[PDB]
Amino acid sequence: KTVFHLGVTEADLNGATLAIIPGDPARVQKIAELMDNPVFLASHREYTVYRAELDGQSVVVCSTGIGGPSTSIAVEELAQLGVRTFLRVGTTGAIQPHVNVGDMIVTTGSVRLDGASLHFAPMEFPAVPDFDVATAMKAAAQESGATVHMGVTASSDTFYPGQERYDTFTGRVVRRFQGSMKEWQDMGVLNFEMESATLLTMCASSGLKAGCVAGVIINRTQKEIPDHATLKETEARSIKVVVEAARKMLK
Amino acid sequence: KTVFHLGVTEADLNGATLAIIPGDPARVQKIAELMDNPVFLASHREYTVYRAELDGQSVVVCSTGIGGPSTSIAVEELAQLGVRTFLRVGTTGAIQPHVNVGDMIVTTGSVRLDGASLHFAPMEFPAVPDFDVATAMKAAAQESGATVHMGVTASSDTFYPGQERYDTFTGRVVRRFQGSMKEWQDMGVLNFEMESATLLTMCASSGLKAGCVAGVIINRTQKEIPDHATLKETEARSIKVVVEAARKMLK
Amino acid sequence: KTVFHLGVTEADLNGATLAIIPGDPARVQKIAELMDNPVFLASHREYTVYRAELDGQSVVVCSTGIGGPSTSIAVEELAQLGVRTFLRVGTTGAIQPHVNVGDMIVTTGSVRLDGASLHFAPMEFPAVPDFDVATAMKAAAQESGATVHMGVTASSDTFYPGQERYDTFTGRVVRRFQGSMKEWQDMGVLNFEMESATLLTMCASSGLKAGCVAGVIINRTQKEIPDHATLKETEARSIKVVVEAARKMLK
Amino acid sequence: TKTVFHLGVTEADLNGATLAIIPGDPARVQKIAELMDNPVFLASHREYTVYRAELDGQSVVVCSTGIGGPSTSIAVEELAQLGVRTFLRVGTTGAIQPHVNVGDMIVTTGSVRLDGASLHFAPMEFPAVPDFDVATAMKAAAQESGATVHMGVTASSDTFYPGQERYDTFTGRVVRRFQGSMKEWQDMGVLNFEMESATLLTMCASSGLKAGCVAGVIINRTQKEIPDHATLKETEARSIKVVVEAARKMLK
Amino acid sequence: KTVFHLGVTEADLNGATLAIIPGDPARVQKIAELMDNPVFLASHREYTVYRAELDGQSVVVCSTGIGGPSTSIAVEELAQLGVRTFLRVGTTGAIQPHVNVGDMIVTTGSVRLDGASLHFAPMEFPAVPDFDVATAMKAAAQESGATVHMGVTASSDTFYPGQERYDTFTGRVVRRFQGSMKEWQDMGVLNFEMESATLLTMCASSGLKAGCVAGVIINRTQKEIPDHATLKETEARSIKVVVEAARKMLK
Amino acid sequence: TKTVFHLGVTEADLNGATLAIIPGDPARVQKIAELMDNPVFLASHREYTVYRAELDGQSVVVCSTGIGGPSTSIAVEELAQLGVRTFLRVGTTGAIQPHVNVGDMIVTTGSVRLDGASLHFAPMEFPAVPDFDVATAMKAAAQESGATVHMGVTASSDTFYPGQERYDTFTGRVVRRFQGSMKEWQDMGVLNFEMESATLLTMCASSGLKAGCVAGVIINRTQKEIPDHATLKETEARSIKVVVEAARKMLK
Ligand SMILES: O=c1ccn2c(n1)O[C@H]1[C@H](O)[C@@H](CO)O[C@H]12
Ligand SMILES: O=c1ccn2c(n1)O[C@H]1[C@H](O)[C@@H](CO)O[C@H]12
Ligand SMILES: O=c1ccn2c(n1)O[C@H]1[C@H](O)[C@@H](CO)O[C@H]12
Ligand SMILES: O=c1ccn2c(n1)O[C@H]1[C@H](O)[C@@H](CO)O[C@H]12
Ligand SMILES: O=c1ccn2c(n1)O[C@H]1[C@H](O)[C@@H](CO)O[C@H]12
Ligand SMILES: O=c1ccn2c(n1)O[C@H]1[C@H](O)[C@@H](CO)O[C@H]12
Ligand SMILES: [Cl-]
Ligand SMILES: [Cl-]
Ligand SMILES: [Mg+2]
Ligand code: NA
Ligand code: NA
Ligand code: NA
DSSP states (O other): OOOSSSOOOTGGGTTOOEEEOOSOGGGHHHHHTTSEEEEEEEEETTEEEEEEEETTEEEEEEOOOSSHHHHHHHHHHHHHTTOOEEEEEEEEEEOSTTOOTTOEEEEEEEEEESSGGGGTSOTTSOBOOOHHHHHHHHHHHHHTTOOEEEEEEEEESOSSGGGTOOSSSSOOOOGGGTTHHHHHHHTTOOEEESSHHHHHHHHHTTTOEEEEEEEEEEETTOOSOOOHHHHHHHHHHHHHHHHHHHHHHOO | OBOSSSOOBTGGGTTOOEEEOOSOGGGHHHHHTTSEEEEEEEEETTEEEEEEEETTEEEEEEOOOSSHHHHHHHHHHHHHTTOOEEEEEEEEEEOSTTOOTTOEEEEEEEEEESSGGGGTSOTTSOBOOOHHHHHHHHHHHHHTTOOEEEEEEEEESOSSGGGTOOSSSSOOOOGGGTTHHHHHHHTTOOEEESSHHHHHHHHHTTTOEEEEEEEEEEETTOOSOOOHHHHHHHHHHHHHHHHHHHHHHHO | OBOTTTOOBTGGGTTOOEEEOOSOGGGHHHHHTTSEEEEEEEEETTEEEEEEEETTEEEEEEOOOSSHHHHHHHHHHHHHTTOOEEEEEEEEEEOSTTOOTTOEEEEEEEEEESSGGGGTSOTTSOBOOOHHHHHHHHHHHHHTTOOEEEEEEEEESOSSGGGTOOOSSSOOOOGGGTTHHHHHHHTTOOEEESSHHHHHHHHHTTTOEEEEEEEEEEETTOOSOOOHHHHHHHHHHHHHHHHHHHHHHOO | OOBOSSSOOBTGGGTTOOEEEOOSOGGGHHHHHTTSEEEEEEEEETTEEEEEEEETTEEEEEEOOOSSHHHHHHHHHHHHHTTOOEEEEEEEEEEOSTTOOTTOEEEEEEEEEESSGGGGTSOTTSOBOOOHHHHHHHHHHHHHTTOOEEEEEEEEESOSSGGGTOOSSSSOOOOGGGTTHHHHHHHTTOOEEESSHHHHHHHHHTTTOEEEEEEEEEEETTOOSOOOHHHHHHHHHHHHHHHHHHHHHHHO | OBOSSSOOBTGGGTTOOEEEOOSOGGGHHHHHTTSEEEEEEEEETTEEEEEEEETTEEEEEEOOOSSHHHHHHHHHHHHHTTOOEEEEEEEEEEOSTTOOTTOEEEEEEEEEESSGGGGTSOTTSOBOOOHHHHHHHHHHHHHTTOOEEEEEEEEESOSSGGGTOOSSSSOOOOGGGTTHHHHHHHTTOOEEESSHHHHHHHHHTTTOEEEEEEEEEEETTOOSOOOHHHHHHHHHHHHHHHHHHHHHHOO | OOBOSSSOOBTGGGTTOOEEEOOSOTHHHHHHHTTSEEEEEEEEETTEEEEEEEETTEEEEEEOOOSSHHHHHHHHHHHHHTTOOEEEEEEEEEEOSTTOOTTOEEEEEEEEEESSGGGGTSOTTSOBOOOHHHHHHHHHHHHHTTOOEEEEEEEEESOSSGGGTOOSSSSOOOOGGGTTHHHHHHHTTOOEEESSHHHHHHHHHTTTOEEEEEEEEEEETTOOSOOOHHHHHHHHHHHHHHHHHHHHHHHO
16 A cells, blocks of 8 residues: 555555654654664665654654645645655744844744645634644653754745745845745744645645754844854754654654 | 733732633633622623632633623733633533533533634644543533533534534525535534634643533434423523533642 | 523514614614614524514614624524524724724625625625615715715624734734735625624525624724713614614515 | 826816716617706716706706726716715616515615625725715606616626526526525515616715615516516606606705 | 628628728828729728738738727727737837937837736736747838837826826826836836737737837937837838738738 | 855865756766766765766756756755846656657646746745756757657645545545646647756746756656556666756856
């Protein structure tokens, strides 16, 4: 029993029902090596797939690529193969002055600035995490000693105009997104990323458990470049946190 | 000093920063009498306002009326007078067969089938509660001995067509809402009500903490009529739960 | 055959096919006492219901609460009990400099800034009164000696941001409503209220006759504060006008 | 002199007119104008034929619009530039209610905005409604002609074919948006279809101009029977008598 | 047989499967006289219809009137009578400084600022010409010696606010269209007209081949007033170009 | 110098390239680059593998995009920052018309915008259409290869599954918006589904960049026949031959 993109069978997952889903294929092996008995399964396109064992239970680690479309394929195919719980770990840009580089954010809902979420539920439907996953992520993040923020994330199909960046080839932002960063800031939105609206909407409308946790790598209100050591520490802590959140989800 | 509709002053609230907001004016005194030193403040239109004390802290109880528009006035005016945390307690119709009459539901996100939410944030923005409020409501519900569900609520500007009821004067439902109850059922939505989309969107986009907990009074999938005793116990338990959730928020 | 919310039966209405529907429950007895043989029927939540006799014919008076959602329940349940004609009487904020406190407005169409209207007809459908009701209301208003304006009303699900009020807790108005009062003023819109779009859409799309008349209590463009006397005269004239408009509708 | 882009007339040509009658068909302009005093041809360009005439001593314009909101919006704007403030549309319509007969008249109280041009003047939320004095005058003139008159909502479509849910077409298909739409409008009490009122009424109600629409019923989508030639000819004559009498009510 | 508006039969078209569709009824005879054996068929409302012969093959010439609605009727009815290819020739306002009066524009796609296109395909569908038509129009326009621009056209249901003209009776443009001309300019749109979105969408979605070619009669960005000779030469070249494009389409 | 956020290359690395070939799959980048002169690996990060090569003496970039508009939009933007002005997409597609066979090629003339990223560049009304020179070059190159070539509209979806109306899925459900959609596109003459052209074409047409899309048909949603290995291998080889010849036509 096979899937179109991921290159793995149900047997290859050794009964896993929980997946950790980073964006970058190069992070998959790093996450898997935090657990026991990491095994490389497949790599094709942006999809690198490992298995490992956590407290004796099989866990998948599968990259998604950037954006909702590639994410939606990985989630669907993993679900076909028995996965029911999806933990997303990644990086994010904060838009609130109070949020520091190196803090962690657990998304409580996403602003749906994507398209793929609409392929699962109409816009009125909330891009919300599973409560148990969000609770596990907050606990794992806080137990690590990180400063943790719970709140709304703006989830964009673009890095550039949808995050209201003007330092671009055209220097233009379409009307819809002009003044948008200030609006989200005034509404209390914490951060930008590019996958949570699709992931959370698709899972919450499909009987799958999902959540998102991210390390803050930049703050759009601070012009200074963050410290290399702080970025290193943040990346390392983010993947230790998601594995501890996975531990808390196991039954 | 004063507000347009609620007929109270900041001084009347004796420093309260938390409000319990039922819909029915007649339930305000019932909630207030579970706390210490309940005092009637005002009644105008659908807005009945009491003050009380919980663990030595002032707490407001204010009715909202039915629907997002009247709710939005109460929340705004209370926020002008210093309230920052809003706990909604109410009744709901379940639409999932596994949810029984007498169970409780804590909303993790709302389907925005309202209008007033759009006066605070565009449709993309998620109608989600404050995570600490949702956590406190879950804990208080569980500690009451209730069966508790966390999940998505469909929040409608109408009782009739927007809940896909056909036993009406015209017997017609507009195209938008034809087949909608089955759509939400298949997407895992737990229940219908008429205020959470407005409340959660307004508060999440305005720096206010909000959540919603409800007792299930009917299940749209079950022919059995619930008896008077189970209904009476459900309304009593709901208001005990919301006051214990308030205690957890003030702690 | 006792309706869900209003607490009355078809028999209670003694054959009435016309209702006067103010917003405030406290105004119901005042309007009923302008007619013969006023009788209190029920009070639950924002719904106070009286019956009276006008030229020997039974007339209902029923409050709606603030907003389309609570209005839509009252209209539906009255229609279930045989009511076919709905006369709304209310207060309003004028937005045109030529409209004075104490004038009366008869709505010829509403700007649909609500949500509940969409639960009856798609946005393309006009929120239009019944021509006979509008004609009766104009005649009653003019015969009273009032200065009467016929025109478009902006009908908002909120009192605050949807009427472009900035004197609020956050002082923020969402993009959709920023600059909206000037836009409506430049398009000749007379006034703001919160129910007519729902009422007129639901009735025009359901085989029910409806209209709206209002006394002006404030003008958003005038700095002067109206005196207590003028406002009292205005409230009194508004309810005398709606009863005379009811007399003109009786067959 | 004051000129306009499309209509080919000047403000002076209108001799002080503040009221226009606006049929769709250029060939109907002279027919309306000859019911008044001193009709004079002013100009014809594209679908816009323009006459002046006099009604109870006051100047009146008669100007065709062509089919559809876009061409109508040009005529209204340019007439407004030249001092016209009141616009009375007369036309033909298909009824969709079984109780409305061929030969009846409909005065529109509001339009379903199934157009595009209305959105160039006001967002969809804004009501496509007539000026109350114009509708009142139209109703009175229609009743006084002996016609059976209906007041109600009109569905105003940018197409004759799919937007009126016609299937007897080249493709036989109707886009999803319009599938089931005639039954929907029928159940909502809509009286009739036409192609200009949403644009006209929205444009005018949002621009300080007084507008209304009155129409003779030429077909009923629910009746298999073919109307006879006589009934149709009588209907077209009575419609233009009615709109001129409505104009008379508006001028005094 | 016959059709509702155009006043012609299939036999009247003597086998024609290609139509040239100008807007102005007065231009029909001019275009037909560029071909052999022009014959007047009918005139009703804005629809003047002629048939002619091009390289021995029958060609229809039929005016559309201004706007998508009247265009949509002509196209439908011609299609009922066997026409499959539609060549629009017209005038246009350039909005780019590099486009001169006398140049020719062949539309490669239209901005759908119309309503009638939506009656054939949802907004996501592209208002795109048939590739063979566009190729033929490019070749004919270049062979004439004109300077030819291939690109996007903004297709508006109005001449005034939808082209962001302020020199109007009210001097107002609705919010949707404020700043729109600069937006289209920055997006590289070449010109405005009023029919292409409807024509291209209806044909591309209905199995019919369509394209648009236009002579530039004015440039919104240039101060120079085109002289009488250049405008007369441009109108003349435009119709010679469309007939040569028709020649290229004949099989 | 300056190095962009994601692609890990500098302007100098591109040796003056103003044209990029942008496949989806990183593994296809070297395969395209080796059909040209002096291919050199530049960088690999995430789904972005970047080579340079020379075609008729001129520098050409080859850069993978990943699946979907979002990751595509990043690659196009960053290449444009580094001087690229022309973008040629080559990929695979599922045909939805019975007349289109596995092994045919499709050149998109316009895309149905069933994506989200296109809206971050232009509102929905704006057409997702290719540069006419690119589409012309792609047609010519495809015909010259011996392929059967179709010009027409492509449905461009943010999903592989529900947005292409697939029911053989974990839930077996398709959201209301997409129920019936494949028949709807079929009856409107749409040729095929893919996942990037709406974003690419809208982004470039609204930003002063020239773009086009050509694809080899790997499946037909209306056919039960399973395509054989040899036909699929020949299709993939021909597609990349075609895009390089189209590039040669663009540089000429
Ligand atoms: O503002 C940001 C900052 C980091 N990310 C982000 N947006 O989106 C995620 C993309 O996968 C990718 C875009 O670089 O990494 C994540
Ligand atoms: O399906 C239901 C069941 C109970 N409620 C509801 N919907 O909405 C709440 C309204 O305020 C009011 C409507 O009766 O009570 C709550
Ligand atoms: O601007 C105004 C002025 C008066 N009203 C109004 N808006 O809406 C009506 C609400 O029911 C309620 C809001 O106070 O009273 C009416
Ligand atoms: O169903 C109908 C019946 C008559 N009309 C109509 N729709 O719209 C008007 C068009 O201008 C034109 C279309 O034939 O005439 C009017
Ligand atoms: O800006 C312009 C310039 C010329 N046209 C135009 N817009 O639209 C076409 C209309 O049919 C009509 C509007 O005058 O002529 C064409
Ligand atoms: O129906 C199809 C068939 C092939 N593709 C597709 N849709 O979209 C392209 C995706 O990048 C990826 C999805 O497999 O490959 C292309
Ligand atoms: Cl939170
Ligand atoms: Cl084509
Ligand atoms: Mg102040
Ligand atoms: Na209420
Ligand atoms: Na026309
Ligand atoms: Na990707």
